[PDB]
């Protein structure tokens, strides 16, 4: 289901709770919110407060709050009041440009991985009524490109240009409760390096947690996809792909991965738990220039319907200005054993 | 050095080529190139040997000043140097002219053509307005010789009003009136067709042009001139004799009204051009008003006419009349509306007409390249080799 | 001035410092074993022995140059028609290492070394995807 | 500099009698208010 | 055009217009035109002492003494007649035309005035062709420095006349394109067996000029024309002189022509590449 | 062909492996988006420079980064005429590098031409189209150099014949 | 700018925005006799050779509308005068044109209907029609009395050259 | 209580009036009196126009407040001569009779807005660049320095450089167009050698700008030489040391104890400091100066040099927010305000 929103690349996209409005960055300092009016997408909202290119957009569903971070070293929390989206500024205290932003599962905090080798965990302080950021710095040595929260609003996966895939603890005492013990670790202060993994090389473009959070998976620039189990003695399994580097990875089940990137089509990976091994399951854009639906590199992948526990449709947003809604239910019967 | 520089003004209608140190150009050729693997690119002609030939196709490289086909421009300047000027390009500096509002990229292409193809020891791409102002110095016999003026450069393309301040052209106030020699020729041709017979269809463009060459003049007042032609119709209607190319014979036509209707479209563009309808005096006033206030008055005191289309009799004088009228009307209206007893100093508008009005740009280029300073303000081929084409993007002005 | 000629960024404690702590380096690939394989006509065995124990952790350039020269001698020692089978006898790591050695050997052309290295590269690409070339581009500790 | 002087050299021919020998019958007459 | 014409245009049009005006009876207009031609030669068309009825065409060559040593004056008097006048200060050969005493046919005088440089050059050629015809062997070679860095050597032998042009190419591209052109010249006798024999020596003087002070350099090439009696005879003397005295400018002109064509090809290829690149945009 | 098609295939594969660029704001400089392969201010963002050589004289150096790739080509030059034609063509094209958006104004040392493809170019152009353009460029530079050489030889032949025919 | 009427007086009658200037007509019509030797028809006939070229006219007065109407009729009259052989035949053609009924202001097909005003009542409509017809007859008569050269058999081309030129790009035929 | 607190920033670009504690100004309007611009370099030249301006501010159209029953805070430019300060105080006390009168240098207002007490403010605007150290919330006049390079001089340099590119510009007619070019494209280079290499060997700095007349001009290298005049005054024929050298010198001319605190809280303000890369360039040049003329060559102790030069994102209304904070968090004090009774002493 390919739709070409506009010719210029879409930097990032974020859906809402009902999956009826999509907020996209059209390689610009503006955020465009499209909604479905019948069977066509109508651009209905325009968000213009960033002084530079927007690099990350997330949409907290329950609070319906859109956090946008850009190269202007700023984060804005847009809230829909009356009929218009108005922003609240978020001080990040970062001297470099923000790259990725992700809301917490409980929507109490959001993480902004930036180019100052920092992750800014920002939370609302009701005492003074402005957002407050806390920095995770060590041992991040290069730019943080990707983030993904554990499904407990405490831990945090961080892919960084220093070739390291990290899992930190973002337990802010002023907004959270005591985190339950996890197989990743038991001692969980803020900024604690809960886990690290790496390879011979490769920038980590995308990280994603499993449904239970005991499994993390990151795609690196060296055409490799890695998955770390916390339960199985904190073990990493690496699959060196024969395809082009993968940019964005998301879990769809407990044992399945969908990763998209510069090869211009999503790919599926299966994690055999008993053997603890990743395997190539099959590309999800087998054709009936580029024969794939996306004419350029797919930049973002995100679960559309059912969430990470019951994912049946996901969405790929590319650098060709295209948004594709892939239904794994149809692809199950399309290919041989695409399960 | 010792050998004089080569001055080539490549206008849209007529290319004016010659050597520095001379009052008038040695060649005034049409800016046309007649062309048909191997050496076939040298089988071409330029100038009067390209207006009409049996087996050749004529093409005009320059449209509205901007060079369109650069290959044709290179071949044209090739036979300019080697067939007409007869100059060894490695020993002669070149003073090329550039159209107003010319892109620096076009300057780079011109420099590349001159250097990487002809290996000239130097090149200076001069702005035409400053050269016109230089030519205007021959008529102003006082110590008021400054490069601040309003050049009305009219040729065969578009008539540019160009305000030059302190030697630098104010490119944000240049305004083009799409009335030039070609429009006047078309209007006179239409007038001749609707009035007289015996004009060969293939010669109507020329037999009109010669009329516009010899019998035209601007009119102080249209109805008065019409009444003069009606009543005193012996000293105003002229006789033009021509020779038909086919079946050679003499034909005589009565050159009447178009004499004063030729340049009148400079002053009433709605006569011929329907899209453009404001007179050249209004265009000059608007151009100068758009300029900074500290330089507005000098632009009035020095209005320089350059190009053949400005060579019509009394054109400058009538322009002075019209511009003084509009300026005085504006001043009176402002004084009446304000009522503050400001009493501004009366504005003196002086359109400088000179004997070198026709080839003003080339005359300025010649007197510029006849000086010691030109050699120390050119762009030597050595500078081209070290720095690159960027040096020819800016050609410094002189006092 | 004269204070702008000092690159402060080099003396900053925030640059990505590669670990470079692999150590070991047991003389890299074995010269005697590959010589015996080449002399005995076991070309596939010669390639397999040449691709074992890469100098992925050796800091000195001399051992890397020696290993590259040995692998290059093996590669040009091959015949074209028998190249493809050899490429299929290596796993993902083996094909990635072979492409690293191929890209190293392109930098020092000699006679028809590039002509057979291009065939090697084509077969290695066919048998190991473009991700092998990507890993050649990305490996900080590369042969 | 030399440009101003060389341009002025023409002034002896330019600074002379009228261009038109007598304005012979075909030019707008002077005496207009202009 | 391919062959460089041997007639200076500016003189031709100026004198033709002046003679047409004189024939029409119109009052002559003052002319003061200084210009230049190939080989660094300077022309001056003026009026002596301000008299409009007389037009003086003066030619100034930086090497007129080396031609005067080979009977330059005798040829100029025989070709131009009484029109030759005492040269103007700063100029070598002056021709005076009285606008009140034109002959019946103006084409001949205008065309001869156009050939002023040709007749300045042709004295040495006439002398050495007569030397070849008369069999006067062993006469000293004529050296003509027609430009500052380029030289010319004329020599007469028993059965041939040698004309060496010592040319200097400014740029390396000039050097290589000249090598290509001269290689084509050397093998040009295949299509024409009656043509003069062209020889090229790059960076090295021929053995004939080795005993002389011929320059040596990477940018300097020597072009030797061997002209036979069928080209030095009276019937073909004029055409041979006309072509030989402009061969150098002809070669340089065609080198620059080749550069212009090469620029045209590059412009075409650049346009093709830019269209290909703009087609790669998602929106075209 | 014997070694042109395999060489072009290898170069195309390496370009696909290298023309995978994403927007990267500068780590060392605030609010700057510089091509990392040029500034080289961060060693972690610079990829390993690779060389693909057809022979000992014709080679392409592809050195990539997170947001930029530099592709330097050494064109074939058989003789002196080919050398001057190649150099003159390259300066011709590089003078208008503002129009060739993915072209450098000056080459790297030892190489004839240098392309710089930034993440912005891959954003506004199809990456596979850019790879195809680079390969088409490598082929057409050689083709046009050969065409210019043949044209110059034929032109010189005609000039010599025309001059010598009039004796 | 385009030339303008100069015979307007405050006491001059106005029919709508149309102006009822007097003429020296030998014919009979609503226009009163004018003591002065200059009339709006004569002023038009004079200014027409320079006004016809103007494609943009500003109506600064109400006699101006009379001027444009007479100018357009002059254009039509020269269109119909090209094919003639004698002054008497020309005058007969002028009378034939005058006795016809070109569109009056307000009716479709009349040029510059957005500039002129419709007649208010039937009496004013009849007055306007008669005035236009009288101006037409006088225009034709004073046109023929001077277009033909003083020596016989010459419909001089000095007025025939304007046949194809339309004032304000408008014509009474459409 | 008292309340009725109004703060009115009087910046050259715009006058912004509002109430204390407001996150954003309630009213903003350009300082236009009619058409004259008496605000040159922040120093008043025509006081009648400013009297009319304040009357307009306090008029019903803007604020509609009683001057005699309201507290006003005014913003003072650095190095304001005492004559202007005294005359403004007299104007407030006599011509308006404000109950609460206070004026302070823009540096302390900036630091209060950002939430700091000690630090150096680099306020560069259109007329002049000011470097103002502040210790314990009180501005130090002794260490304040002025560099006569600002947006106007950078714009003039950019015009000169664009003429060097062959673009027919004028210094009096095309000032605003080049000003917009400087805003949209110009930036501060980090390593001028490296930036010059990138400009002379690569076309990534070339950006197209559409002039009002429709002509497209490609601005390339000149994106970074225009702001470089701040660091190298000699490029615009101005005697000086440069903004970074001046800042280092004015810090080093202070007390030894406060140097470390001043290093870590150097804040930028003003429109002319919005150039990309300016904080990074200032940090690099200050580190180089510390290496050269404090460390004297060695690099071991350079890591201990903690410098934190942050340009605040909320730069547009810094002075107004500082005024609101100052006049809201501590308005209820008595000895702070200068009252009319003290004036009539
Ligand atoms: N009296 C006149 N004097 C000169 N030219 C006249 C005259 N009447 C008509 N013309 C015509 O006016 C035109 C002037 O052409 P001109 O050479 O000035 O144009 P250009 O090459 O475009 O000029 P420029 O060098 O200023 O760009 C010619 O066609 C010429 O025949
Ligand atoms: N985003 C920007 N990037 C670069 N320069 C900018 C930017 N915005 C504004 N400027 C420049 O900053 C200056 C504006 O100065 P500012 O608004 O701080 O005025 P000010 O301090 O009140 O002035 P003054 O010195 O006259 O009192 C102008 O030169 C303008 O061109
Ligand atoms: Mg022109
Ligand atoms: Mg300020």
Domain parsing of chain C, residue ranges: 1-143
Strands, DSSP E only, in chain B? 6-10, 14-19, 27-30, 33-35, 44-46, 57-59, 62-63, 66-67, 94-98, 123-127, 149-153, 159-165, 168-169, 175-177, 238-243, 250-255, 303-306, 351-352
The number of the ligand 1 atom at minimal distance from the alpha carbon of B132 is 26
CB contact under 8 A, A99 and F25: yes
Domain region containing A309? 2-334
Cβ-in-10-Å burial (0-12, 13-18, 19+) of F77 comes to middle
E strand or H helix at H29: strand H27-29
Q: What is the 3-state secondary structure (H, E, C) of G112-152?
A: CCCCCCCCCCHHHHHHHHHHHHHHHHHHHHHHHHHHECCCC
How far apart are alpha carbons H171 and H181 in whole angstroms?
A: 14
Binning chain H into helix, strand and coil, the percentages to the nearest 5 are: 40, 20, 40
How far apart are alpha carbons E33 and H271 in whole angstroms?
A: 61
Which 8-state DSSP code applies to residue E277? H
- Those residues whose C-beta lies under 8 Å from the C-beta of residue C32, and which sit 6 or more positions away, are none
Residues in chain H: 345
How far apart are alpha carbons A283 and A267 in whole angstroms?
A: 4
What spacing in Å lies between the alpha carbon of B12 and ligand 3's midpoint?
5
Domain B181-265 superfamily per CATH:
ATPase, substrate binding domain, subdomain 4 (3.90.640.10)
Binning chain B into helix, strand and coil, the percentages to the nearest 5 are: 40, 20, 40
Q: Which of B194, B195, B222 sits opposite G50 (nearest CB)?
A: B222
Q: Which of G50, G53, G158 sits opposite B256 (nearest CB)?
A: G158
How far apart are alpha carbons B246 and A83 in whole angstroms?
A: 81
Q: Provide the 10 A C-beta neighbour count for residue H279.
A: 24
Q: Are strands B250-255 and B238-243 parallel, antiparallel or unpaired?
A: antiparallel
Spacing of C-alpha A278 from chain mean position: 21
Q: Residues F120, F122, F124, CA angle at the centre, nearest 5°?
A: 70
| Resolution of the coordinates, Å | 3.2
Q: Using CB atoms, list chains with 3+ pairs below 8 Å to chain G.
A: B
Spacing of C-alpha H83 from chain mean position: 22
Query: For E171, phi and psi rounded to 5 degrees?
Result: -110, 160
How far apart are alpha carbons B75 and B71 in whole angstroms?
A: 6
How far apart are alpha carbons B82 and E260 in whole angstroms?
A: 13
Q: Provide the 10 A C-beta neighbour count for residue H284.
A: 24
Binning chain F into helix, strand and coil, the percentages to the nearest 5 are: 50, 15, 35
How far apart are alpha carbons G107 and A10 in whole angstroms?
A: 61
- CB B32 within 8 Å of CB B121: no
Six-digit token string for B3: 């050998």
How far apart are alpha carbons C89 and B154 in whole angstroms?
A: 81
Angle between helices B315-338 and B280-290 in degrees, nearest 10: 60
Cβ-in-10-Å burial (0-12, 13-18, 19+) of H20 comes to buried
Q: Are strands E142-144 and A144-149 parallel, antiparallel or unpaired?
A: unpaired
- CB H186 within 8 Å of CB H225: no
Q: For CA atoms F129, F133, F136, F140, give the dihedral sign.
A: positive
How far apart are alpha carbons B317 and B323 in whole angstroms?
A: 10
C-alpha distances in angstroms, E102 versus C96, E23, E33, E105, F124? 94, 8, 21, 8, 74
How far apart are alpha carbons F128 and G163 in whole angstroms?
A: 66
DSSP string, C46-111: HHHHHTSS--SS---HHHHHHHHHHHHHHHHHS-STTHHHHHHTS-HHHHHHHHHHHHHHHTS--T
CB contact under 8 A, C107 and F55: no
- CB E186 within 8 Å of CB E231: no
Which 8-state DSSP code applies to residue A337? S
Spacing of C-alpha G44 from chain mean position: 7
Which of B47, B136, B155 to mutate for ligand 1's pocket (most ligand atoms within 8 Å of CB)?
B155
Six-digit token string for F43: 């060693």
- Those residues whose C-beta lies under 8 Å from the C-beta of residue B13, and which sit 6 or more positions away, are B30, B31, B155, B156, B157, B181, B182
- Find the residue in C nearest to H283 (Cα): C8
Q: Which of B303, B314, B219 is nearest to B265 (CA)?
A: B219
Q: Which of A199, F51, A239 is nearest to C137 (CA)?
A: F51
Q: Is cis: bond before A139, omega within 30 of 0?
A: yes
F15 close to C (CB below 8 A): no
Six-digit token string for B368: 């510029």
Deposited experimental method = cryo-EM
Residues in chain F: 167
DSSP string, G31-73: SPB-SSS--HHHHHHHHHHHHTT-S-----SSHHHHHHHHHHH
Q: In whole angstroms, how large is the CA radius of gyration of chain F?
A: 19
- CB B219 within 8 Å of CB B265: no
Residue E119 three-state SS? helix
How far apart are alpha carbons A108 and A100 in whole angstroms?
A: 17
How far apart are alpha carbons G6 and G25 in whole angstroms?
A: 19
- Those residues whose C-beta lies under 8 Å from the C-beta of residue F87, and which sit 6 or more positions away, are F112
Q: Whose CA is nearest to atom 3 of ligand 2?
A: H183
- Those residues whose C-beta lies under 8 Å from the C-beta of residue H317, and which sit 6 or more positions away, are H16, H24, H25
Q: Provide the 10 A C-beta neighbour count for residue A141.
A: 17
Region of H296 (left: φ > 0; alpha: ψ -120 to 50; beta: rest) is left
- How many cross-chain Cβ pairs, A to C, lie less than 8 Å apart? 56
Q: Are strands H5-10 and H71-76 parallel, antiparallel or unpaired?
A: parallel
C-alpha distances in angstroms, B322 versus B206, B221, B280, B309? 31, 11, 9, 18
Buried b (16+ CB within 10 A) or exposed e, H170-184: bbebbbebbbebbee
- CB H172 within 8 Å of CB H165: no
- How many cross-chain Cβ pairs, B to G, lie less than 8 Å apart? 42
Residue E66 three-state SS? helix
CB contact under 8 A, G164 and B274: no
Residue B8 three-state SS? strand
Q: Provide the 10 A C-beta neighbour count for residue E73.
A: 13
Residues of C with CB under 8 A from a CB of H: 2-4, 6, 8-9, 11-13
- Reported for D22-28, long-range contacts at CB under 8 A and 24+ positions apart, including other chains, are D25/B235, D26/B215, D26/B217, D26/B235, D26/B236, D26/B238, D26/B259, D27/B217, D27/B313, D27/B314, D28/B217, D28/B218, D28/B219, D28/B220, D28/B225, D28/B260, D28/B313, D28/B314
Residues in chain A: 339
- CB A114 within 8 Å of CB A143: yes
The nearest CA of chain E is from the CA of F93 a distance in Å of 7
- Those residues whose C-beta lies under 8 Å from the C-beta of residue A141, and which sit 6 or more positions away, are A117, A160, A162, A164, C14, C16, C17, F44
Residue E229 three-state SS? helix
- Those residues whose C-beta lies under 8 Å from the C-beta of residue H82, and which sit 6 or more positions away, are none
Tell me the chain E residues in contact with residue B36 when contact means C-beta distances shorter than 8 Å: none
- Reported for D8-17, long-range contacts at CB under 8 A and 24+ positions apart, including other chains, are D8/B137, D8/B138, D10/B23, D10/B138, D10/B355, D10/B356, D11/B138, D11/B141, D13/B355, D14/B138, D14/B139, D14/B354, D14/B355, D15/B141
C-alpha distances in angstroms, H101 versus E275, H106, H335? 68, 16, 12
CB contact under 8 A, A244 and C130: yes
- CB F48 within 8 Å of CB F69: no
Q: What is the dihedral of CA A140, A141, A146, A148, to 10 degrees?
A: -10
Domain region containing G127? 1-174
Q: Which of A11, A244, A290 sits opposite F20 (nearest CB)?
A: A244
CB contact under 8 A, A202 and C141: no
- Find the residue in A nearest to E282 (Cα): A7
Q: In whole angstroms, how large is the CA radius of gyration of chain B?
A: 23
What spacing in Å lies between the alpha carbon of B158 and ligand 1's midpoint?
11
A29 close to F (CB below 8 A): no
What spacing in Å lies between the alpha carbon of G58 and ligand 4's midpoint?
53
Q: Are strands H266-269 and H309-310 parallel, antiparallel or unpaired?
A: parallel
How far apart are alpha carbons E262 and F150 in whole angstroms?
A: 11
- CATH number, domain with residue A134: 2.130.10.10
Spacing of C-alpha A227 from chain mean position: 16
Six-digit token string for E106: 């103006």
Residue A339 maps to a domain: no
Residue B159 three-state SS? strand
Residue in this structure with the two tokens 């580029």, named with its chain if needed: A290
The number of the ligand 2 atom at minimal distance from the alpha carbon of H13 is 22
Residue in this structure with the two tokens 């400088």, named with its chain if needed: B352
Residue E117 three-state SS? helix
Q: What is the dihedral of CA F136, F139, F144, F146, to 10 degrees?
A: -170
How far apart are alpha carbons C87 and C96 in whole angstroms?
A: 11
Six-digit token string for A75: 């984060």
Residue in this structure with the two tokens 């905090």, named with its chain if needed: A109
CB contact under 8 A, C131 and A221: no
Six-digit token string for G67: 């001027």
Q: For CA atoms F130, F136, F142, F145, give the dihedral sign.
A: negative
C-alpha distances in angstroms, F118 versus E24, F70, F133, G76? 73, 9, 15, 70
C-alpha distances in angstroms, C4 versus B75, F30, H215, H284, H306? 51, 19, 38, 9, 19
- CB A207 within 8 Å of CB A215: no
B183 lines ligand 1 (CB under 6 A): no
Six-digit token string for F158: 């005609």
- CB A219 within 8 Å of CB A259: yes
Six-digit token string for B59: 């093409």
Ion ligand 3 neighbours, Cβ < 5 Å: B 11-12, 155, 157
Tell me the chain A residues in contact with residue C19 when contact means C-beta distances shorter than 8 Å: none
Q: In whole angstroms, how large is the CA radius of gyration of chain A?
A: 19
How far apart are alpha carbons E7 and E245 in whole angstroms?
A: 12
E strand or H helix at E46: strand E41-46
Helix count and strand count (H, E) for chain B:
14, 18
Q: What is the 3-state secondary structure (H, E, C) of E126-181?
A: HHHHHHHHHCCCCCCCEEECCCCCCEEEEEECCCCEEEEEEEECCCHHHHHHHHHH
- Those residues whose C-beta lies under 8 Å from the C-beta of residue A339, and which sit 6 or more positions away, are A281, A332
Query: For B307, phi and psi rounded to 5 degrees?
Result: 105, 160
Cβ-in-10-Å burial (0-12, 13-18, 19+) of E4 comes to buried
Q: Provide the 10 A C-beta neighbour count for residue E133.
A: 15
Helix count and strand count (H, E) for chain A:
1, 28
Pocket around ligand 2: residues whose beta carbon is below 6 Å from it? H 11-13, 41-42, 125-127, 151, 179, 182-183, 270-272, 274-275
Q: Which of C39, C2, B60, B176 is nearest to H293 (CA)?
A: C2
Which 8-state DSSP code applies to residue B379? -
Residue in this structure with the two tokens 């007390």, named with its chain if needed: H255
Six-digit token string for A121: 């965990």
């Amino acid at each position: 289901a390919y739709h070409s929103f506009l010719v210029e690349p879409i930097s990032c996209h974020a859906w809402n709770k009902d999956r009826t409005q999509i907020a996209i960055c059209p390689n610009n300092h503006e955020v465009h919110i499209y909604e479905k009016s019948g069977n066509k997408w109508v651009q209905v909202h325009e968000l213009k407060e960033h002084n530079g290119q927007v690099t990350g957009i997330d949409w907290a569903p329950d609070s319906n709050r859109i956090v946008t971070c850009g190269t202007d070293r700023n984060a804005y929390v847009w809230t829909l009041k009356g009929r218009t989206w108005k922003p609240t500024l978020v001080i990040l205290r970062i001297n470099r440009a923000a790259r990725c932003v992700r809301w917490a599962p409980n929507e109490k905090k959001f993480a902004v991985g930036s180019g100052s080798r920092v992750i800014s965990i920002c939370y609302f302080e009701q005492e003074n009524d402005w957002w407050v950021c806390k920095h995770i710095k060590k041992p991040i040595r290069s730019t943080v490109l990707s983030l993904d929260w554990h499904p407990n609003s405490v831990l945090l996966a961080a892919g960084s240009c220093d070739f390291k895939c990290r899992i930190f603890s973002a337990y802010i005492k002023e907004v959270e409760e005591r985190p339950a013990p996890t197989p990743w670790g038991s001692k969980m202060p803020f900024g604690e390096l809960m886990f690290e993994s790496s390879s011979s090389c490769g920038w980590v473009h995308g990280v994603c947690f499993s449904a239970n959070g005991s499994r993390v998976a990151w795609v690196s620039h060296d055409s490799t996809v890695c998955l770390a189990d916390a339960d199985k003695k904190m073990a990493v399994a690496t699959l060196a792909s024969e395809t082009l580097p993968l940019l964005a990875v998301t879990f769809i089940t407990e044992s399945s991965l969908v990763a998209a990137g510069h090869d211009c089509f999503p790919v599926l990976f299966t994690y055999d738990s008993a053997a603890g091994k990743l395997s190539f399951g099959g590309r999800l854009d087998v054709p009936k220039g580029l024969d794939s639906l996306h004419k350029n590199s797919v930049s973002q992948i995100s679960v559309l319907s059912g969430g990470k526990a019951k994912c049946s449709q996901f969405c790929t947003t590319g650098m060709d200005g295209g948004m594709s809604i892939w239904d794994v239910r149809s692809l199950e019967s399309a290919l041989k054993d695409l399960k | 050095g010792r050998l004089p520089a080569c001055v080539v003004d490549c206008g849209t209608g007529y290319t004016k080529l010659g050597y520095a140190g001379n009052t008038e150009p040695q060649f005034i050729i049409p800016s046309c190139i007649a062309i048909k693997k191997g050496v076939d690119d040298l089988d071409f002609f330029i100038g009067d040997e390209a207006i009409e030939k049996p087996t050749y196709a004529t093409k005009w490289p320059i449209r509205h000043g901007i060079v369109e086909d650069w290959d044709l421009m290179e071949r044209f300047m090739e036979q300019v140097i080697f067939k007409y000027l007869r100059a060894e390009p490695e020993d002669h500096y070149f003073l090329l002219t550039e159209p107003p509002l010319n892109t620096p990229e076009n300057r780079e292409y011109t420099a590349e053509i001159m250097f990487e193809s002809f290996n000239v020891p130097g090149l200076y791409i001069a702005v035409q307005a400053v050269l016109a102002l230089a030519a205007s110095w021959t008529s102003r016999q006082v110590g008021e010789r400054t490069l601040t003026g309003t050049v009305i450069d009219s040729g065969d393309g578009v008539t540019h009003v160009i305000p030059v301040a302190e030697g630098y052209v104010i490119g944000s106030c240049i305004k083009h009136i799409p009335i030039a020699g070609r429009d006047i020729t078309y209007f006179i041709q239409q007038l001749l067709r609707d009035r007289e017979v015996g004009i060969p269809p293939e010669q109507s463009l020329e037999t009109a042009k010669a009329v516009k060459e010899r019998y035209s003049y601007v009119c102080p007042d249209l109805v008065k001139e019409f009444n003069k032609y009606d009543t005193d119709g012996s000293k105003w209607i002229k006789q033009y004799t021509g020779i038909n190319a086919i079946s050679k014979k003499e034909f005589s036509i009565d050159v009447g009204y178009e004499r004063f209707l030729g340049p009148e479209i400079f002053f009433h563009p709605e006569f011929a051009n329907p899209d453009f309808t404001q007179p050249i005096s209004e265009v000059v006033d608007e151009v100068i008003q758009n300029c900074p206030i500290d330089v507005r008055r000098p632009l009035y005191k020095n209005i320089v006419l350059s190009g053949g289309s400005t060579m019509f009799r009394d054109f400058g004088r009538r322009l002075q009349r019209d511009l003084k009228r509009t300026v005085d009307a504006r001043l009176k209206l402002s004084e009446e509306l304000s009522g503050g007893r400001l009493k501004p100093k009366p504005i003196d508008v002086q359109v400088i007409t000179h004997h070198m009005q026709r080839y003003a740009v080339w005359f300025g280029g010649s007197m510029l390249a006849s000086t010691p300073e030109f050699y120390q303000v050119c762009h030597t081929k050595k500078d081209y080799e070290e720095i690159g084409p960027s040096i020819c993007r800016h050609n410094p002005v002189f006092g | 001035a004269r204070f702008r000629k000092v690159d402060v960024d080099e003396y900053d404690e925030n640059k990505f410092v590669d670990e470079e702590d692999g150590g070991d380096g047991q003389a890299g690939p074995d010269e005697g074993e590959v010589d015996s394989c080449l002399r005995q006509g076991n070309m596939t065995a010669a390639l397999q022995a040449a691709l074992k124990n890469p100098p992925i952790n050796t800091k000195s350039q001399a051992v890397k140059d020696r290993a590259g020269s040995i692998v290059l001698k093996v590669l040009i020692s091959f015949k074209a028609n028998d190249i493809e089978k050899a490429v299929q006898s290596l796993d993902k790591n083996g094909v990635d290492l072979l492409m690293k050695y191929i890209y190293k050997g392109f930098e020092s052309p000699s006679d028809n070394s590039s002509a057979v290295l291009l065939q090697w590269h084509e077969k290695a690409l066919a048998a190991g995807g473009v991700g092998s070339i990507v890993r050649v581009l990305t490996a900080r500790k590369t042969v | 500099a030399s440009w101003t002087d060389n341009i002025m050299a023409q002034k002896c021919s330019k600074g002379a009698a009228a261009e038109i020998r007598e304005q012979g019958d075909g030019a707008e007459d002077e005496e207009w208010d202009d | 055009m391919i062959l460089l014409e041997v007639n200076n245009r500016i003189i031709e049009e100026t004198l033709a217009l002046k003679f047409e005006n004189a024939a029409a009876g119109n009052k002559p207009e003052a002319v003061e035109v200084t210009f230049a031609d190939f080989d660094g030669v300077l022309y001056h068309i003026s009026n002596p002492n301000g008299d409009k009825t007389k037009v003086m065409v003066s030619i100034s060559l930086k090497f007129y003494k080396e031609l005067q040593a080979h009977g330059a004056d005798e040829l100029l008097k025989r070709v131009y007649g009484s029109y030759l006048v005492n040269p103007e200060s700063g100029y070598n050969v002056s021709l005076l035309y009285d606008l009140e005493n034109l002959p019946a046919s103006k084409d001949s005088i205008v065309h001869q005035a156009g050939m002023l440089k040709r007749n300045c050059f042709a004295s040495v050629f006439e002398k050495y062709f007569q030397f070849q015809e008369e069999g006067k062997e062993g006469e000293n070679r004529a050296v003509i420095h027609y430009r500052d860095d380029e030289t010319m050597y004329v020599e007469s032998k028993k059965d041939r006349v040698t004309v060496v042009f010592s040319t200097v190419f400014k740029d390396d591209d000039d050097v290589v394109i000249g090598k290509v052109f001269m290689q084509e010249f050397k093998e040009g006798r295949r299509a024409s067996h009656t043509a003069p024999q062209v020889l090229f020596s790059h960076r090295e003087p021929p053995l004939e000029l080795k005993d002389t002070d011929a320059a040596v350099g990477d940018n300097i090439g020597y072009i030797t024309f061997v002209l036979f009696p069928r080209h030095t005879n009276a019937s073909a003397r004029d055409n041979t002189i006309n072509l030989i005295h402009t061969f150098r400018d002809y070669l340089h002109y065609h080198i620059k022509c080749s550069k212009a064509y090469i620029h045209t090809r590059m412009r075409a290829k650049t346009s093709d590449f830019l269209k290909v690149l703009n087609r790669a945009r998602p929106d075209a | 062909t014997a070694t042109l098609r395999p060489y072009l295939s290898a170069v195309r594969a390496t370009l696909q492996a290298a023309l995978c660029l994403e927007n990267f704001s500068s780590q060392v400089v605030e609010r700057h988006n510089k091509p990392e392969v040029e500034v080289r201010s961060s060693k972690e963002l610079l990829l390993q420079p690779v060389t693909i050589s057809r022979n000992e004289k014709e080679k392409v150096l592809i050195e990539g980064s997170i947001n930029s790739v530099r592709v330097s080509i050494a064109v074939k030059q058989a003789d002196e005429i080919e050398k001057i034609l190649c150099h003159k063509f390259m300066r011709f094209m590089m003078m208008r590098a503002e129009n060739f958006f993915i072209l450098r104004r000056k080459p790297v040392e030892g190489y004839d031409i240098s392309f710089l493809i930034t993440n912005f170019h891959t954003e506004q152009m199809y990456k596979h189209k850019l790879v195809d353009f680079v390969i088409h460029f490598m082929e057409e530079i050689d083709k046009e150099i050969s065409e210019m050489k043949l044209s110059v030889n034929a032109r010189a032949r005609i000039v010599a014949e025309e001059f010598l025919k009039n004796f | 700018p385009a030339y303008h009427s100069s015979l307007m007086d405050p006491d001059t009658k106005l029919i709508g925005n149309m102006a009822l200037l007097p003429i020296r007509s030998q014919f009979k019509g609503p226009a009163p006799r004018e003591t002065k030797d200059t009339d709006i028809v004569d002023e038009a006939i004079y200014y027409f050779k320079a006004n016809v070229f103007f494609k943009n006219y500003e109506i600064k007065n109400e006699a101006d509308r009379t001027l444009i109407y007479i100018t357009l009729y002059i254009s039509e009259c020269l269109k119909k005068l090209q094919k003639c052989n004698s002054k008497s035949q020309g005058e007969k053609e002028m009378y034939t044109l005058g006795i016809t009924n070109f569109p009056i202001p307000g009716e479709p097909g009349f040029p510059l209907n957005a500039i002129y005003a419709k007649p208010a009542n039937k009496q004013e409509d009849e007055v306007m029609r008669a005035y236009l017809q009288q101006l037409r007859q006088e225009t034709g008569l004073r046109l023929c009395e001077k277009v033909f050269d003083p020596q016989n058999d010459k419909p001089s081309k000095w007025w025939t050259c304007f046949v194809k030129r339309q004032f304000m790009n408008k014509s009474l035929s459409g | 209580q008292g309340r009725k607190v109004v703060v009115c920033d009087n910046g050259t670009g715009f006058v912004k009036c509002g109430y204390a504690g407001s996150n954003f100004p309630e009213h903003i309007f350009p300082a236009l009196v009619g058409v004259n611009y008496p605000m040159e370099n922040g120093i008043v030249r025509n006081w009648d126009d400013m009297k009319h301006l304040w009357d307009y501010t306090f008029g019903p159209e803007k604020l509609n407040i009683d001057t005699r029953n309201c507290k006003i805070l005014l913003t003072e430019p650095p190095m304001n001569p005492t004559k202007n300060r005294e005359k403004i105080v007299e104007v407030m006390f006599e011509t308006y009779q404000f109950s609460g009168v206070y004026v302070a240098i823009q540096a302390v207002l900036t630091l209060y807005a950002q939430g700091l007490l000690t630090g150096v403010v680099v306020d560069s605007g259109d007329g002049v660049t000011h470097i103002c150290p502040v210790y314990e919330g009180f501005s130090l006049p002794h260490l304040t320095r002025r560099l006569d390079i600002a947006g106007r001089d950078i714009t003039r340099y950019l015009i000169k450089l664009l003429l060097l590119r062959g673009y027919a510009f004028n210094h009096s007619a095309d000032f605003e167009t080049v000003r917009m070019i400087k805003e949209k494209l110009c930036y501060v280079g980090y390593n001028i050698e490296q930036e010059q290499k990138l400009a002379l060997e690569t076309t990534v700095l070339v950006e197209s700008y559409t002039l009002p007349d429709g002509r497209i001009i490609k601005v390339g290298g000149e994106r970074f030489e225009a702001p470089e005049a701040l660091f190298q005054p000699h490029l615009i024929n101005v005697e000086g040391v440069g903004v970074a050298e001046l800042l280092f010198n004015t810090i080093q001319a202070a007390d030894i104890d406060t140097r470390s605190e001043f290093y870590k809280h150097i804040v930028l303000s003003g429109g002319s400091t919005m150039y990309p890369g300016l904080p990074s360039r200032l940090e690099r040049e200050l580190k180089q100066l510390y290496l050269e003329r404090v460390l004297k060559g060695d690099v071991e102790k350079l890591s201990k040099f903690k410098i934190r030069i942050e340009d605040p994102p909320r730069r547009k209304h810094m002075v107004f927010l500082g005024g609101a904070v100052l006049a809201d968090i501590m308005k209820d004090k008595d000895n702070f305000w200068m009252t009319r009774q003290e004036y009539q002493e």
